[PDB]
Amino acid sequence: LTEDQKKKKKEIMEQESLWKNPDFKGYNKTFQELHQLSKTFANNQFRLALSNYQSGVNTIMKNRDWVEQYRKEEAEKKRLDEKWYWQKVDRKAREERVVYREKMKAKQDALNYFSKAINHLDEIKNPDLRERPEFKRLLSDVYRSWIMAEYDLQNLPQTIPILELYIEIDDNEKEYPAHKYLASAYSFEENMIKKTKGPDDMLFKYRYKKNVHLLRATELKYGKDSPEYKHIVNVIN
Amino acid sequence: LTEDQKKKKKEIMEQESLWKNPDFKGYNKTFQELHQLSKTFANNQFRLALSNYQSGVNTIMKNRDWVEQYRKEEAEKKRLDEKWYWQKVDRKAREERVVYREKMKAKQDALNYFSKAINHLDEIKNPDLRERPEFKRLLSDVYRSWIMAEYDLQNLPQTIPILELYIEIDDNEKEYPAHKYLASAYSFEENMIKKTKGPDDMLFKYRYKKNVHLLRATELKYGKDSPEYKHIVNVIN
Amino acid sequence: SGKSMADTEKELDDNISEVNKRLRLHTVLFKMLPHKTVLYKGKPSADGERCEAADKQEAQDNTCLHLEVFDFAKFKKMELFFEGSNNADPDPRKEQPRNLTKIRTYIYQNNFLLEDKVISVIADVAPNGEPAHNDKIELFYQHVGKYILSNVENPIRNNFKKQFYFKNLDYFDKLFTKIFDYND
Amino acid sequence: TMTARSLNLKGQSGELLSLSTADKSNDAIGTLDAALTRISKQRANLGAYFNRL
Amino acid sequence: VSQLIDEVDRIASQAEFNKMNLLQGDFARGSRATSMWFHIGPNMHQRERVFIA
Secondary structure (H helix, E strand, C coil): CCHHHHHHHHHHHHHHHHCCCCCHHHHHHHHHHHHHHHHHHCCHHHHHHHHHHHHHHHHHHHHHHHHHHHHHHHHCCCCCCCCCHHHHHHHHHHHHHHHHHHHHHHHHHHHHHHHHHHHHHHCCCCHHHHCCHHHHHHHHHHHHHHHHHHHHCCCCHHHHHHHHHHHCCCCHHHCHHHHHHHHHHHHHHHHHHHHHCCCHHHHHHHHHHHHHHHHHHHHHHHCCCCHHHHHHHHHHC | CCHHHHHHHHHHHHHHHHCCCCCHHHHHHHHHHHHHHHHHHCCHHHHHHHHHHHHHHHHHHHHHHHHHHHHHHHHCCCCCCCCCHHHHHHHHHHHHHHHHHHHHHHHHHHHHHHHHHHHHHHCCCCHHHHCCHHHHHHHHHHHHHHHHHHHHCCCCHHHHHHHHHHHHCCCHHHCHHHHHHHHHHHHHHHHHHHHHCCCHHHHHHHHHHHHHHHHHHHHHHHCCCCHHHHHHHHHHC | CHHHHHHHHHHHHHHHHHHHHHHCCCCCCCCCCCCCEEEEEEEEECCCCEEEECCCCCCCCCCEEEEEEECCCEEEEEEEEECCCCCCCCCHHHCCCCCEEEEEEEECCCCCEECCEEEEEEEECCCCCCCCCHHHEEEEEECCEEEEHHHCCCCCHHHHHHHHHHHHHHHHHHHHHHHHHHHC | CCCCCCCCCCCCCCCCCCCCCCCCHHHHHHHHHHHHHHHHHHHHHHHHHHHHC | CHHHHHHHHHHHHHCEECCEECCCCCCCCCCCCCCEEEECCCCCCCEEEECCC
């Protein structure tokens, strides 16, 4: 390969890791690096913003532990009225409901915390401070977890304004997962217009934005004028 | 073991002994030394402060004797209406309440005496006398017994201002149990915020202060350049 | 009595000495991080009380180590200023100690109170000399005024070394050692 | 008192024309127990106060 | 029969009065040893004990 292709391969893997579903080592790493930055920043409102963000992810992490425990406790119940197919079918469906409803509340609590983290960052008014690498990384990570919390519950239209704010910050636009999620969420919205028989202007708006971020994700991972880039361009043209 | 490790090992054992639950040999040693120090000090308000501290410790010692005698007298009773498991459990729980309530009153009386010992030490205004080891040796003994009296009854939030005053007083700070109790009491307070869904500022304040004194306790007992100090800080970040 | 004070002060003089003897070893880091820790290599500069980070962190002529320690803001800083040049050999596993000319520390957060005042800056101008070097320790007090530790009544002088200065010497010497071990 | 006297849950699971939904049903009813408790007992204070007057 | 068995466990668990659980194993002790003591006369020592599970 070329030096740029080798570099690119390394970077795409780092970006996929960056967007990894949360776990205890990633929680540690993510907060450890966000911890580095707030230290240098030495700004009480940024300190508060991170305190709220971390409380939000803690809600998510505590929920993930709850979901395993709940499924465990259900698995360990002896189910005597479950001898016919439909009976097991029900109890599976109710397990999905209780888990989904609790995950929905955990998401709502996590987003209230993320909203508070953003409201505290909003109080940093000095443009010399808002342009700090410390400011931009935290604001990016708050948006990323917000996007992921909604994404996991299939709330894809809601991820669009946050993905769009995300890619505007400090070269986030060059992240392959960011464009993949934008393209997928736009695709969903296009399909919503087709299923609900909505207006053509919105059909084409969503289709256009899907194709822009589809092609950009392709360019970023495979390179301009790669067999894969050429393919997506030829489909669009 | 090196000259530093031998010193450290020896000191940790002396410190663990210093914070040993009270008994008759420790009582005797403590008050023989305090009375000799009082004779050296030749200060009527210190003498009074010591008289009150000793009365407080006597309350604690008399209570320990009561608890053994009470449990003995209960063990020796014939229980004719104890046919069921739930009857045995109920009666056990009632015993535990009587012991806990009497220990709570003994703690309250002991802390009234410790408060009086402090109020008398407060009356020594001359800065040349307040800086005497005799003065702050007693004040350290009062707060140490005070901390332990509360700790035993799980009154951990109440131990924090006294532990903090303790380590600021006359060279106590390098005592590993003092930092262990601070870390444990802060951990309790962190858990209280997590369980009661309290404010984020207090969660992370308490979590931080747990980690500071956890790390300092680690440094003191397990040593600088131990795998133990290396690990704890890397987790804490 | 004054006997206990005298013995305790002696123990603390030796505690700061033994750690200063370990701190003088961090020369091994010039030819060479734990979390919350940022190390810079540099040279004594300005008025001789502060350490200026190098443009070339790996440079063989660095004679000061500047370590910033963070937690939840900057909480602590230490500057180790060494007497003598480094060994020509580029391998840090072979490098030897250099007596410290000075140790300068700063406390920004986790401020300790000595008789209700904060000593935010401590300047030791004879860290590898006689353990009893209180007259070589400048204390910068906030409620920052300059006091000399040897003119501090004594407990007060004892509380200073056990609550403030030994802490920073041992906290920093360990964080420097972590970096060394991780890269060595 | 105001609606923010209890956990003021709005909307309900499913499709809405709002952007809010209620929380875990188990707590939602439990919250109404809290609402009932908080206000009724506050009336108790006024009741008791009246008796004092 | 299977659900009839499950229904029994649920009745015992959910059979509340004034937020007291009156059938599951919180008798003669739950988190607290307090049980169904009733005060029947106007004075002290005019008491009754009930247990059930």
